[PDB]
């Protein structure tokens, strides 16, 4: 069988340097590692031993629409099929009391998680469907705070999408609130809102593409991966007691090497053909269809976000 | 006469920010601003109110060549006619001790201030001659520490290019010295061998392709800009100390803008067509050819240099 | 003669209440009262006194463009003939440290005092030019302090329009900053910009539109008036504190009443018919063209202020 | 091409002795030696082996009109074509407490070194004109004290032209003051303002003659040449101290011969036929163009020299 391609995103930090290692060390796969920092994704690439045929570098700044579509261009530049998408790239700003944000507009955590990949996923889409490979998939990462099912959910700030009124209002922030709900600035509800953004875009492209095409469409929730670079902007005293506290007292600590060894076999396991699916894996290394929230699960809330972020790309 | 085409680097920050401005606030001019952060592109532009249908960000990582390569095969791709190139990205680590690296191995100051400069002027030339443009000129930016002639090039740490030691080694570091002289690694001696090299680079294309072409050639000092970030990795001490020292005991201070007005003179200026002249600007702004140092302006070294470059980045 | 008409702004409050009860109480005069607010214009025209006959209160919201185009309809379809148009209007922030933005996106002191005027005037420029009245006036008020030559120009904050960064990036505040010099945001130094954004207004006026038609433009510093309602939401220690250290310490208290007539004094004096003058007012009642800063007076700034409002605004 | 005729003033002693031998051993330049000493001039041609065909020792006292006008009137009887004239004599007085004046009453140090050359070179100009040589050259000698960018202009004493209050009233110093600028007399600023002065000449020669007739004008520095006769009035211990110090400390020592050879390099060279360049030399035998002062290069100050000089000597 051909090598197959992969295009994965953020591959410079943790969980998408472990997919890339994971899935080039076997020698059956072509990794496209898409990263904002060209010098941080050569120097990854390098201490990770990965073989200089399997890996190639292109740039891709997910807060700017422009660099999507110029990664687009390029990438149906080079003549090369393209078979499974990975979105994993996410920035968290625990303690902003002001905003930061992306070019067009929007607050920064909202496009880069979500708008980003909505954009890029329906621009590449089209390359996907024209491809001759057997087993195409689109992979999505969430987070299982996201859900408010669980403990982690019902932490005192958790995610809420109650009108989409702030994406309706288009997240500029100015006469409005940046925040989607319309409350006040919170540096981690919005994250959340975007990992539920991003199950909800999993759920309607399954609903509109799974029987026209054939695209697998997946999303995953890996476990707590403390020692990556997501808690960068967060303070010194958290990154020092959060992975002990995960580790010991809620035993939720899971290793990057399994993380990308789990995300891998998301994209290339034969059995796990079933497209929907909330993803989730066991303290035993098993994979099972985790459930999602009412409101994440909630079709008209989907169908609403799906129509105002094409509004906002630009794609009507 | 048809809007001319600029690609500037580094324009998100003061120098190359400011030049953009002055050739857009014109209406003469499209300006390419290919930078390493498309993000941080944006905001500077937007700030500096360019117009929107002047300027279109591209990406550029100087210190990989792959970045280069692309940037290159993308705006071939626009189908777009180049005609100024204007070099003036730089990266300076007054206070290191242990050394940062490039993607190909090189010191990080070389790699970024010439060789990357390096492969995409000789790239973009072909292109350049390939345009039916009235005036074509390639600009690199120098410093005047540079050159040994004046006090500020005599400050204790001073430039030296002895036997091009290092640049034949190849800069890895590895069972050799980074410094191309061989010395003990210094941040400031690093930096001012890179402007010695662009200057030395400006010499050769005017000596190899002025009379087969028709484009001019040109180096400048603008000026002692202490508020650009530059120095952002120096210590805050200095950072608020130098710029009144520049400002009153020196009187070399120059402003941002007058700074932008200058290079942007040297860009589109009908009198300024004498190619291979290390310009210079006097108190009462006026221009005028400053003298570079004896070893600046050697021949056999800017050949041996010429030659190393050339095989380094794998033209050969 | 025929009564002629008077639109006053912000007629609600002191100035230009004031103004309107001196010019009703001569009895050759009908005044337009354009406010915000059209229930606190009928209690202040009835409690000044004012004939019912010679008022005719009209709506106009500086901040938004639809209003200022809705009262311009409304106004031509009054079939009345236009004189005088004075522009009085102004929105004071001294305590902000998040900054509030009008409908447009820009920040809410530049608009209302500089934005919507602008606009205002040159839609009415053309009422004007097409009336028969023997003087046609423009009547824009100005503070001292938005001059750096006197004392209360130098309080420690203060004026300063360096680029026009912050207006060519349109004051969204988005990837930009509020301020147009592009300054952390200040409550005084915006309505400061403002004021000498409208000194450069009626310059620019005067150059262009003085040979031309034969409308007077003018603009005057009444005083310090410290009992009106621009001071509302600094502190009360404050407004207690202000008008007797202005009676006594500075002498520079005038009363209202005096604003009022000597306002009035300019909008039908024989002898002020001298346009571009920057009047001011004498400790015995006596009228003197005061001289501007050096940066007020400058054309070229103002020429550039021109040309960015008027794109700001969709005039072009 | 035929032997061609160099006018060369101040030949007895050390500069124009070198630069008639380097013109003189060549074969290929008839020498003219104007010298206010005829005997002085026979033993210095013979000391230094000219060949008795090349030179042609004939009377010039600058101080003095009519010895100018009668060897003007000689020079044309010869009947002989003119093409260079150089003009390099100075008397230089360091240390005098009362002044010695010329003829006409000029302070000795002005008449000499400008006025005097600025006749000559006027009256010889039609002569020069009517000359089939190829290149034909005006050189005017200078100093580099002259200029205050340098350290060497910027010794405790140095030149000043503020307002031409002296040139203006004649310099007889009757009822006025020697000094151009009105100051106290010192030997040293005399003779830097004529050097000034003749820069400016230049300056103003190339503006008004240069299109019209194609005489390349141009000015030059050597060096210090500290063997001279020009410190003969200077104490002893001067004279001693002074070139060991410009040797070893300063490192600007040249040697005669070394500043003959430029100096006919400057009469004799293809390239150098750039006009109004104060040319200079470099370390390396490199010839270069040097950059003026601010006031050296002021052109109202040298038009008002040009007037004011062509009044005191009669051509009105
Ligand atoms: N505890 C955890 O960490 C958990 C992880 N996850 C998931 O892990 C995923 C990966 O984040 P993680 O590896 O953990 O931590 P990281 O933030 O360190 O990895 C994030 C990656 O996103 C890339 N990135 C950020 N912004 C952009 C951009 N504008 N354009 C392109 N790439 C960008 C970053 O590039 P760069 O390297 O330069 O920063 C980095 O490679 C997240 O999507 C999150 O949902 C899920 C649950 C919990
Ligand atoms: N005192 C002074 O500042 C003087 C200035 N100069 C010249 O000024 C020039 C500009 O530097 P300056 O504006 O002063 O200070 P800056 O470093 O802030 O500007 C440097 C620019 O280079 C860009 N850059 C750095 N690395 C890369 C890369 N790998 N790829 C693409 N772009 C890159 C930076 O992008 P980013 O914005 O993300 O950092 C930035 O825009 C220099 O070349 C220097 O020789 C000359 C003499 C003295
Ligand atoms: N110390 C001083 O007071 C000095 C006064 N001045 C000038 O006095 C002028 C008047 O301000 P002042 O009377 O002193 O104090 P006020 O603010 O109380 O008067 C301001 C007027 O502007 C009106 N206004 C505000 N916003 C809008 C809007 N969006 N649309 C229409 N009208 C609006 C207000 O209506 P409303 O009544 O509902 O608030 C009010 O009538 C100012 O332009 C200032 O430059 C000059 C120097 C100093
Ligand atoms: N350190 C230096 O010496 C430097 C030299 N120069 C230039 O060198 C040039 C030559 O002076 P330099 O050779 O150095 O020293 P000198 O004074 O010994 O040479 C001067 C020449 O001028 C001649 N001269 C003086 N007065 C008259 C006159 N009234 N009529 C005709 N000729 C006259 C002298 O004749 P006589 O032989 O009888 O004295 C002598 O030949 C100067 O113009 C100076 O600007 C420039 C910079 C520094
Ligand atoms: C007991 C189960 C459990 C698990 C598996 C996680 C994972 C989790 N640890 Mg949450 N967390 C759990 C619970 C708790 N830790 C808690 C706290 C906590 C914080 C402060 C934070 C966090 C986070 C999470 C996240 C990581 C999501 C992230 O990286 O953005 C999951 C999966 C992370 C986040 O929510 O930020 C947006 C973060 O800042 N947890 C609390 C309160 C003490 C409880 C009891
Ligand atoms: C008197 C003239 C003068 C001028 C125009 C500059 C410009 C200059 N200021 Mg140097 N400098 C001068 C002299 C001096 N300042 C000096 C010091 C100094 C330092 C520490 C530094 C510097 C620098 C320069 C540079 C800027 C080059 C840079 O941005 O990298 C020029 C043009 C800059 C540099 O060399 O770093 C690589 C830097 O770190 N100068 C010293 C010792 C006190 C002297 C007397
Ligand atoms: C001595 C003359 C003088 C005059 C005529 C005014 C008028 C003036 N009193 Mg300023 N002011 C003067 C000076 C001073 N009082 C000062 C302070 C001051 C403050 C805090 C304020 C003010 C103001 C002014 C203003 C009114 C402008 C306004 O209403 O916005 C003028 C004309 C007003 C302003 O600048 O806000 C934008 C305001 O908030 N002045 C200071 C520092 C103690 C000095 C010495
Ligand atoms: C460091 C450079 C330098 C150069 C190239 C010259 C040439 C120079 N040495 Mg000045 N001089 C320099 C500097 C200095 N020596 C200095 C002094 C000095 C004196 C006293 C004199 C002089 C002179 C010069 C002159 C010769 C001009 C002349 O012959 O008239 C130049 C070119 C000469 C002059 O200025 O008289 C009018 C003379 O009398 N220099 C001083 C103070 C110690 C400094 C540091």
Same mark, same amino acid.
């Given at each position: 069988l051909r090598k197959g391609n992969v295009v994965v995103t953020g591959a410079s930090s943790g969980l998408?340097? &472990?997919?890339?290692?994971?899935?080039?060390?076997?020698?059956?796969?072509?990794?496209?590692?898409? $990263?904002?920092?060209? !010098?941080?994704? *050569?120097?990854?690439? #390098?201490?990770?031993?990965?073989?200089?045929? %399997?890996?190639?570098?292109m740039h891709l700044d997910l807060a700017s629409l422009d660099s999507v579509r110029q990664?687009?261009?390029?990438? +149906? +530049?080079? *003549?090369?099929?393209?078979?499974?998408?990975? $979105?994993?790239?996410?920035?968290?700003?625990?303690?902003?009391? *002001?905003?930061?944000?992306?070019?067009?507009?929007? =607050?920064?955590?909202?496009?880069?998680? @979500?708008?980003? @990949?909505?954009?890029?996923?329906?621009?590449?889409?089209?390359?996907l469907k024209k491809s001759?490979?057997?087993?195409? +998939?689109?992979?999505?990462?969430?987070?299982?705070?996201?859900?408010?099912?669980?403990?982690?959910?019902?932490?005192?700030? #958790?995610?809420? !999408?109650?009108? !989409?009124?702030?994406?309706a209002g288009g997240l500029n922030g100015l006469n409005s609130s940046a925040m989607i709900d319309g409350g006040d600035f919170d540096g981690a509800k919005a994250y959340k809102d975007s990992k539920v953004c991003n199950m909800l875009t999993m759920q309607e492209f399954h609903r509109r593409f799974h029987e026209e095409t054939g695209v697998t469409f997946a999303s995953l929730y890996p476990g707590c991966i403390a020692s990556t670079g997501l808690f960068r902007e967060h303070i010194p005293l958290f990154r020092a007691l959060f992975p002990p506290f995960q580790k010991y007292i809620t035993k939720g600590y899971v290793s990057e090497t399994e993380?990308? #060894? +789990?995300?891998?076999?998301?994209?290339?396991?034969? %059995?796990?053909?079933?497209?929907?699916?909330?993803?989730?894996?066991?303290?035993?290394? &098993?994979?099972? =269809?985790?459930?999602? %929230? =009412?409101?994440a699960s909630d079709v008209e809330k989907a169908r609403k976000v799906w129509e105002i972020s094409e509004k906002l790309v630009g794609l009507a």
């Open positions: 998408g340097l &472990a997919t890339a290692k994971a899935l080039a060390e076997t020698g059956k796969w072509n990794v496209i590692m898409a $990263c904002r920092d060209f !010098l941080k994704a *050569e120097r990854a690439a #390098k201490s990770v031993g990965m073989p200089k045929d %399997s890996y190639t570098v990664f687009v261009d390029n990438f +149906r +530049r080079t *003549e090369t099929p393209l078979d499974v998408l990975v $979105c994993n790239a996410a920035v968290y700003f625990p303690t902003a009391k *002001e905003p930061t944000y992306s070019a067009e507009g929007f =607050e920064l955590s909202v496009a880069t998680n @979500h708008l980003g @990949h909505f954009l890029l996923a329906r621009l590449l889409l089209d390359d001759d490979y057997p087993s195409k +998939r689109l992979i999505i990462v969430g987070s299982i705070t996201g859900n408010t099912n669980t403990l982690a959910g019902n932490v005192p700030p #958790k995610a809420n !999408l109650g009108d !989409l009124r702030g994406l993380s990308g #060894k +789990r995300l891998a076999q998301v994209v290339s396991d034969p %059995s796990l053909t079933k497209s929907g699916v909330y993803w989730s894996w066991n303290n035993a290394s &098993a994979s099972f =269809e985790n459930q999602l %929230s =009412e409101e």
